Amino acid sequence: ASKLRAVLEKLKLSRDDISTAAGMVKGVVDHLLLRLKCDSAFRGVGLLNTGSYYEHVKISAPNEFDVMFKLEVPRIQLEEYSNTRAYYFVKFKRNPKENPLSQFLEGEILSASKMLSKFRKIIKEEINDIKDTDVIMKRKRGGSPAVTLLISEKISVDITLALESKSSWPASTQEGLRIQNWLSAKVRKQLRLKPFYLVPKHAKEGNGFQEETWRLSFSHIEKEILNNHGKSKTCCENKEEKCCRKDCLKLMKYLLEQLKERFKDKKHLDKFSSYHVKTAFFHVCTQNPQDSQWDRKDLGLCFDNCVTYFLQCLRTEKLENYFIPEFNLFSSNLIDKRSKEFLTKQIEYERNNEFPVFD
Q: Which residues carry a binding-site annotation?
A: 50, 52, 64-66, 158, 201, 215-222, 229, 235-236, 243, 253, 274-278
Q: Does 299 bind Zn ion (CB under 5 A)?
A: no
Q: Does 230 bind Zn ion (CB under 5 A)?
A: yes
How far is 136 from 222, CA to CA, in rounded Å?
Answer: 30
Q: Which x/- pattern over 236-275 shows residues binding Zn ion (rule: CB under 5 A)?
A: x------x--------------------------------
Q: Does 176 bind Zn ion (CB under 5 A)?
A: no
CB 36 within 8 A of CB 122: yes
- CA distances from residue 32 to 38, 175, 326, 345, 355 in whole angstroms, order as listed: 10, 38, 37, 44, 42
Closer by beta carbon to Zn ion, 4 or else 335? 4
For Zn ion, which stretch binds (CB under 5 A), given 174-182, 225-233, 277-285, 309-317? Answer: 225-233
Tell the smallest beta-carbon distance from residue 245 to Zn ion (Å). 5
Closer by beta carbon to Zn ion, 243 or else 329? 243
For Zn ion, which stretch binds (CB under 5 A), given 79-87, 166-174, 190-198, 222-230? Answer: 222-230
For Zn ion, which stretch binds (CB under 5 A), given 165-173, 232-240, 261-269, 279-287? Answer: 232-240
For Zn ion, which stretch binds (CB under 5 A), given 193-201, 234-242, 266-274, 311-319? Answer: 234-242
Closer by beta carbon to Zn ion, 126 or else 291? 291
How far is 157 from 299, CA to CA, in rounded Å?
Answer: 33
Cβ within 8 Å of residue 84, ≥6 positions away? 203, 327
Tell the smallest beta-carbon distance from residue 297 to Zn ion (Å). 14
How far is 324 from 216, CA to CA, in rounded Å?
Answer: 9
Closer by beta carbon to Zn ion, 101 or else 243? 243
State the Cα angle at 43 between 37 and 49, rounded to 5°.
70
Q: Centre a 10 Å sphere on the Cβ of residue 99 and count the other Cβ atoms it contains.
A: 14
Number of residues that bind Zn ion (CB under 5 A): 4
- Indicate the annotated binding residues for ATP: 52, 64-66, 219-222, 253, 274-278
CB 325 within 8 A of CB 176: yes
For Zn ion, which stretch binds (CB under 5 A), given 93-101, 113-121, 185-193, 233-241? Answer: 233-241
Cβ within 8 Å of residue 55, ≥6 positions away? 222, 223, 226, 227
Q: Are strands 155-165 and 64-72 parallel, antiparallel or unpaired?
A: parallel
Alpha helices, DSSP H only, in the chain? Answer: 2-12, 15-36, 112-125, 185-192, 219-227, 245-262, 274-287, 299-316, 337-352
Closer by beta carbon to Zn ion, 162 or else 248? 248
Residues recorded for the chain: 359
Query: Which parts of 334-353 interact with Zn ion (CB under 5 A)?
Result: none
Closer by beta carbon to Zn ion, 244 or else 329? 244
- Indicate the annotated binding residues for GTP: 50, 158, 215-222
Closer by beta carbon to Zn ion, 159 or else 236? 236
CB 241 within 8 A of CB 118: no
| Closest C-alpha to 29, from 158, 140, 222, 165 | 158
For Zn ion, the binding residue among 41, 61, 105, 235 (CB under 5 A) is: 235
Binding site for Zn ion (CB under 5 A): 230, 235-236, 243
